[PDB]
């Protein structure tokens, strides 16, 4: 049993920035994961490989709504990933391929 988010192949839970860097190597544009900081529950960073390195997009919450750009907002993290899977909408790349959680 788990939450929907817990079962999402791109969701790695509480891993560090440095551990994400090792998971997203070698670079492959559009390979991605989301990790959570131990600082605070639901403090997420979307980590995506693009143009030979990892880009890190930290989620913010504004009145409980999630964004990574202060332009486009979502109710939850799964909606955010869904959106950027289909088009870049200003990100460095679409989220093309999950780095599958093991």
Author numbering: 73 to 174
Give sentences copied directly from the paper behind this entry.
C-terminal Src kinase (Csk) and Csk-homologous kinase (Chk) are members of the CSK family of protein tyrosine kinases. Csk and Chk both contain SH3, SH2, and kinase domains, which are separated by the SH3–SH2 and SH2-kinase linkers.
Crystal structures of both oxidized SH2 and C122S SH2 were solved and refined. Intrinsic fluorescence of oxidized and reduced form of L-SH2 domain, as well as that of the cysteine mutants C122S and C164S L-SH2, was measured to examine the role of the disulfide bond in the stability of the Csk SH2 domain. U,W0 of the reduced, oxidized, C122S and C164S L-SH2 are 27.5 ± 0.7, 42.2 ± 1.6, 29.4 ± 0.9, and 26.3 ± 0.9 kJ/mol, respectively. All of the three forms of L-SH2 without disulfide bond were greatly destabilized compared with L-SH2 containing disulfide bonds with free energy value reductions ranging from 12.8 to 15.9 kJ/mol. X-ray crystallography data were also consistent with the NMR observation, in which most of the changes in chemical shift took place in the residues close to C122, and this area was likely to undergo greater structural change than in the C164 residue area. The overall backbone position of C122S and the oxidized form in the crystal structure is nearly identical, suggesting that the disulfide stability results from reduction of entropy of the unfolded state.
